[PDB]
Amino acid sequence: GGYTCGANTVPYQVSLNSGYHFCGGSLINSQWVVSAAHCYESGIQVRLGEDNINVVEGNEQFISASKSIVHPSYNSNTLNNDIMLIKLKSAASLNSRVASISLPTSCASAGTQCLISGWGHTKSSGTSHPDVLKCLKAPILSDSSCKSAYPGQITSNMFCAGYLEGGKKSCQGDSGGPVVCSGKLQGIVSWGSGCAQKNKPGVYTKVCNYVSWIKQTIASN
Ligand SMILES: [Ca+2]
């Protein structure tokens, strides 16, 4: 059922704001954020150090995005390759409440526990969500169970995490938000029925497939 994370306990969590909070993301170094390609839009301000997104509480850093880079192979219909990089106009000041999260060196396996965090905003969904950061500890599901949950839709660039029993909904992640497992960013909140229906898993972009692209893109921009 998840829980309130606690202010600044997820220091890599970011809010993307274009007048209002519209997506999450993950700080991966002082000047770059990873999010979902379906989060793309103009005039992004990156908000770090947030807990309540409607109240200035004292640990925020607001930094304009200088550049967004959608994956070359992003398909908005299938959500294959749902990943985007956002460069910050200035480097964030890193401390205990604002910190980067490591990229994976290896992919994660079914059964591994992950932390999904966010304010529960699914972009363009029109759905209600809280103003403080929420968290869910959830396991990665097997390939076969993921495909069985979403026949014909799961590519090699996606994985499922969450619960197939319990009779609850999981609405913690924002579009573009982090799935962190054993201190590595393994997933990005992409799509699924995990919030709309009970007993369904979320679907996440499989970050480990993109580490080479992320590193090369950052190194050149
Ligand atoms: Ca705030």
From Swiss-Prot:
It catalyses: Preferential cleavage: Arg-|-Xaa, Lys-|-Xaa. Synthesized in the acinar cells of the pancreas. Its main location: secreted. It is an enzyme of class 3 (hydrolase). Is inhibited by scorpion cyclotide trypsin inhibitor TopI1. It is found in: Secreted, Extracellular space. Keywords: Calcium, Digestion, Disulfide bond, Hydrolase, Metal-binding, Protease, Secreted, Serine protease, Signal, Zymogen. CDD domains: Tryp_SPc. One of its GO terms (biological process) is proteolysis. Disulfide bonds join C5-C135, C23-C39, C107-C208, C114-C181, C146-C160, C171-C195. Ca(2+) binds at E50, N52, V55, E60. Subsequent cleavage after Lys-123 leads to alpha-trypsin. Further cleavage after Lys-168 yields pseudotrypsin. A cleavage may also occur after Arg-97. Its EC number is 3.4.21.4. One of its GO terms (molecular function) is serine-type endopeptidase activity. Belongs to the peptidase S1 family. This is Serine protease 1. It comes from Bos taurus (Bovine). The lineage of its organism: Eukaryota, Metazoa, Chordata, Craniata, Vertebrata. The gene is PRSS1.
